[PDB]
Design a protein around this nucleic acid. Structure first.
Lengths: 198, 210, 135
RNA sequence: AGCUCGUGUCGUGAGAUGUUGGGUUAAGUCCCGCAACGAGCGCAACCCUUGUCUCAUGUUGCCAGCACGUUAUGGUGGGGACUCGUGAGAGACUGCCGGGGUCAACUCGGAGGAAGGUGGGGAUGACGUCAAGUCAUCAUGCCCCUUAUGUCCAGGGCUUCACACAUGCUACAAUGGCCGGUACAAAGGGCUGCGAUGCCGUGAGGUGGAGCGAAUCCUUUCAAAGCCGGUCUCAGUUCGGAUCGGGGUCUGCAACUCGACCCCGUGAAGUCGGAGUCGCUAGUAAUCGCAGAUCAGCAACGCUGCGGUGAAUACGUUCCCG
RNA sequence: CGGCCAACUACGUGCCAGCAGCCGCGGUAAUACGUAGGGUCCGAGCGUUGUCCGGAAUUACUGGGCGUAAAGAGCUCGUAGGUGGUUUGUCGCGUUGUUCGUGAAAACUCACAGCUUAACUGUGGGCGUGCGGGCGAUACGGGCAGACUAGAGUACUGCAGGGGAGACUGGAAUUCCUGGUGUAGCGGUGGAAUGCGCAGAUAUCAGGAGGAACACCGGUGGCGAAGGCGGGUCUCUGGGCAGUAACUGACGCUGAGGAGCGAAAGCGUGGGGAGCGAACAGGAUUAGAUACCCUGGUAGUCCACGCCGUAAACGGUGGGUACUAGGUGUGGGUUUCCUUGGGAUCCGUGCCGUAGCUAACGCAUUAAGUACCCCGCCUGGGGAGUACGGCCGCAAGGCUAAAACUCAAAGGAAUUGACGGGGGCCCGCACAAGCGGCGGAGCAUGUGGAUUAAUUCGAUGCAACGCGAAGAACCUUAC
């Protein structure tokens, strides 16, 4: 990924809507032996997302690096994924496993900061979280820890969803501090939203 | 390795015309010598200008030197000042008198020689080589009416020690078909690390037009 | 005739075969047969022959449909997995050996009998015509 | 005869699939299937030459029917009839019939036809390999020389020779040698070039210049092997020509080191060649001359082409090689 | 101021001199060595070395594993131990609630005050995760006292079986023996030769000896805890399964050490010794065979009595228990229905298959799935299952089991290729069928080598060597 700063007198750079947040996690040239030598190709693990908390995971195969990055962008574009939150935190401590990828995603009080390793830091920095506390146990990789983090975010659910599963009136599903954090986060949603209307 | 014959020399009987045209018995070696020194004399300032083709028709010892380029305005500066200087030096180096016709190509980016010009002159200018090619194309892919393209670049690419050849294309470029109308142009970039020889194949169409 | 793999998920490639089929039939109403070499004419006879005999419905489709009706979820597994993958609801016939969890709106029954299967085709085809009448 | 790619699907991933299966092909040629559907570079086709005919076609080319030659022949008035020369066009497509084919591709036979199934041969080298070759064709990055590693000339060398390899040529003879008579080519080459009749030589050649920038003139009307005849009688020879001596001619300022050719003599090895190994499947192999480029001359037995005469064998994939 | 890891250019040496935490940088164009500019990070400091915690979920209580990656004892029985179905009562030992006492000060944490600020110091809380006393609770664990029948075991009726041991015996075949019949070969091999023969072999017939192994049934089949078990019959004995529910009433599970069983080879003493056969000869093959192949051949293989204790003792999967879609074979037994067929059931053993699981292959009601109980075991590769020491053993050896040192890996599964003296299907003057040659002779050209003042320079498997040269007397021409 070099020589991107450019000014063209051509038709268009085609800049348009959906200015999302896009992170390229790792690139390892992938070789293939054929008759008389090696054929080098490229893999780019592409994370895309918006600051609401919708995450994509794309996996680009091409024999050029920006081609593989662009194919990962289109593949994560094809496949988004909804993550439920509280304010800008996570709901409750989970462990995700993608066959060797263990990631523990635990919430924290706000202000602490996204503390995670670089793959999980990528998937969570694209997402709508600002203050959680994760760790990547096992598998020491990028692909399995990204995919394990997304499986970990599939083990998430709303407080309300849990209440619904059990047919119980909330209050009765959460404890009270987390309901107060719901009041804080929806209150600042009201303040920034009504400042957004004017 | 790739033992690929120059396709403008592989279809020079069938589709592509000769560049130089006369008849000569016992005057032929002299006409060859004048043809060579004329093309060396039209190498430098016209390769600044954007030269593509240098045809020399030759009637009863006058001469007619015709050049196809991409900017009438650098070849013809002030009228007669830039034209009649190289014209007059062609009149003095040859022992003859020169009728220099200068003409523009309707699209520079679909001449394979001019594509090789712009690509190699970008590649001497420290740009990214995969970006250059890839932009060598996109443009030409187009634009007129141009059914192939194939760009190869060997040499010290990016200043590296290994001489890596690259091979990008789009569409149909059949070399073994003789009704191909393929334009071919190889021009050689001059970096400080060395020379990056650029080959460009451009397949315009199936049309024989016999 | 034969379920081509990747009709629904890959529509952007198999639509090009359709426009080439339109250019073939529009050059069949043209009448250029003798001006070309007959190896190319017999070759286009093979292209129109196979491409018309195997592709008849997407000739009318154009439009990445909202529903799919499936006979024999077992044998036509490719169509049911592709139809599930886009989010398109599946309406099917289900024998004793078909997994009903892949089909959202089933109609259970034997598929081996032409009377029963063909009658259920009459059911849902009359249903679609009943949709067309009030529209 | 393969090498890939796009988009879809499969897989955590490298990747796969497509491109595998059934049949078919000179061929990933082509059909039928199949989570693939398509494309691209190859293969084929387009181009040149060879094989048949049609139309056009008349000099420098042909000469039948005409006329005139006599010595020498199309040599000459003439003629488009035959060639031939070069332009356009037809013609081979499994197109037509029989059988196998899954009623698909394709294969076995037959007809017509100059030609039958990619008719013959070319030109045409995919993605890449081998750090293959070339900084001496050229161009060139960097390093080195700049009082020499530049440059000018004479002489020498690149041709030396106890050897060893490699590709060729002439042989070892009677399907042959030598003398005499005689018949048939194709293509080419030519300006300070190709150079005829005639004369002088034994012969390289000398003297001379006809005539041609060449379907015309010259390379003789072109060949050699072929055919008819005579002689040689199986031998180190009328085989074989190396070597060496004398005597010349031509080219060039100059043939000593180092040119070719001719004449006279000289007359060696060599009796079909150990292990091994090479080429070739039809106008091929084998053998026979001819021309060309480079070139003042030639180390040309080389290279590139042209034609002449012209075979044997292929049961078949076990074995060696790719 | 390569990468991690904020920060790059030139000059100088070109596998040297040096660098480096690991990966790794130096073979005349190093952003990795040395010097320079320049940048970055810190700052009265900044680097190095050592020692500890961290990252290391890498000794995993919180928080790991054991089919193939390190890792399931060869298999059982059982001592301590750990663990415990249903239910009534009681105790208050575990557990829990509460209050009292205590946990010195300092530190630590929160607030505040004081020193120009801060470090620092002080005041007041909290912390002091604990322990002892009093009072309360009784679900769960436990103790005691009882009750129950589903687990466990017993009785009864059957049933299947190479389960084991002892004893007696059967035939086919191999070898030798005596006797016929009868002649020059037999045997053996890719091809042969040592070898047995011509003194009567091999061949065939009759009889005799003796030993071992059990054709066919017999296989993806039965039984055993695992090793393992197949001629027959008899005698003694072990386990399993089903059916009824008659009895006992939790007597269960596992099991550190421990005892027992445990293929083959091997060991001791005494028998036996046909076939096969290590070692050991000769023969052959081969460069050479201390090998394969051949001919012979001793211990051994066999039995009696003991040792030994090991195996790819492998399902590479410790034992127990409950649950979790199915489909189809076959083994043992009960019953409802058609009337042997089908169903249902309990126990067994295979093949395919969801969910789920796994690194992947795979597993998948006979789990590698979901959970509980107990045991074994693993902690990078070598060094090494080795030394030292002890224990057992007649010995061979087994068991238990390190360190220095060294490496930056050693591994598992799958992928793309190449490769195979792997398989299949194909082709090419690739072989076969022919014809003509080369290799021996003379010369012509080119190369090697040696010469030389100079023998200019290039091109050395196929794809260099009548090749750059389509013309070396001078020129060419580089020497």
């Amino acid at each position: 990924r070099g020589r991107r700063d450019d000014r063209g007198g051509r038709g268009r750079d085609g800049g348009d809507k959906s200015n999302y947040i896009e992170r390229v996690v790792s690139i390892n040239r992938v070789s293939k032996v054929v008759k008389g030598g090696r054929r080098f190709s490229f893999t780019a693990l592409v994370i895309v997302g918006d600051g609401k908390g919708m995450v994509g995971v794309g996996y680009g195969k091409a024999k050029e690096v920006p081609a593989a990055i662009a194919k990962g962008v289109e593949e994560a574009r094809k496949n988004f994924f909804r993550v439920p939150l509280i304010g800008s935190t996570i709901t409750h401590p989970v462990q995700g496993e993608a066959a060797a990828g263990v990631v523990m995603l635990r919430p924290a009080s706000p202000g602490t900061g996204v503390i995670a390793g670089g793959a999980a830091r990528a998937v969570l920095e694209c997402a709508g979280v600002h203050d959680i506390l994760a760790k990547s146990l096992g598998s020491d990789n990028a692909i399995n820890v990204v995919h394990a983090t997304v499986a970990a975010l599939k083990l998430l659910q709303r407080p309300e969803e849990v209440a619904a599963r059990r047919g119980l009136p909330i209050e009765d599903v959460a404890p009270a501090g987390m309901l107060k954090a719901r009041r804080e986060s929806e209150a600042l949603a009201a303040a920034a939203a009504r400042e957004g209307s004017a | 390795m790739g033992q690929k014959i120059n396709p403008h020399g592989f279809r020079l009987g069938i589709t592509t015309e000769w560049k130089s045209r006369w008849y000569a018995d016992k005057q032929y070696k002299d006409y060859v010598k004048e043809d060579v020194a004329i093309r060396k004399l039209l190498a430098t300032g016209l390769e600044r200008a954007g030269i593509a083709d240098v045809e020399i028709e030759r009637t009863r010892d006058r001469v007619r030197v015709d050049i196809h380029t991409a900017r009438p305005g650098i070849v013809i500066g002030r009228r007669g000042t830039e034209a009649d200087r190289i014209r007059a030096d062609l009149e003095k180096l040859t022992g003859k008198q020169v009728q220099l016709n200068i003409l523009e190509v309707k699209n520079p980016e679909s001449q394979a020689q001019l594509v090789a010009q712009g690509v190699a002159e970008q590649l001497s200018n420290r740009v990214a080589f995969r970006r250059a090619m890839r932009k060598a194309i996109q443009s030409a892919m187009r634009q007129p009416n141009v059914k192939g393209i194939r760009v190869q670049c060997s040499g010290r690419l990016g200043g590296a020690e290994m001489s890596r050849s690259e091979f990008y294309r789009e569409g149909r470029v059949p070399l073994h078909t003789l009704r191909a109308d393929i334009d071919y142009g190889l021009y050689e970039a001059k970096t400080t690390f060395g020379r990056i020889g650029v080959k460009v194949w451009i397949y315009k169409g199936d049309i024989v037009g016999g | 005739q034969r379920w081509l793999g990747g009709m629904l998920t890959n529509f952007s490639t198999v639509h090009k075969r359709l426009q080439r089929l339109k250019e073939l039939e529009a050059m069949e109403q043209t009448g250029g047969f003798e001006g070309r070499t007959k190896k190319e004419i017999l070759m286009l006879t093979r292209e129109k022959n196979k491409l018309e005999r195997s592709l008849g419905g997407i000739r009318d489709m154009q439009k990445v449909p909202s529903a799919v009706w499936v006979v024999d979820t077992n044998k036509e597994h490719i169509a049911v997995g592709e139809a599930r993958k886009l989010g398109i609801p599946v309406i099917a016939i289900l024998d004793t050996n078909c997994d009903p969890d892949v089909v959202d709106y089933p109609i259970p029954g034997n598929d081996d009998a032409i009377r029963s299967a063909a009658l259920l085709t009459k059911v849902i085809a009359s249903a679609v015509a009943e949709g067309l009448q009030a529209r």
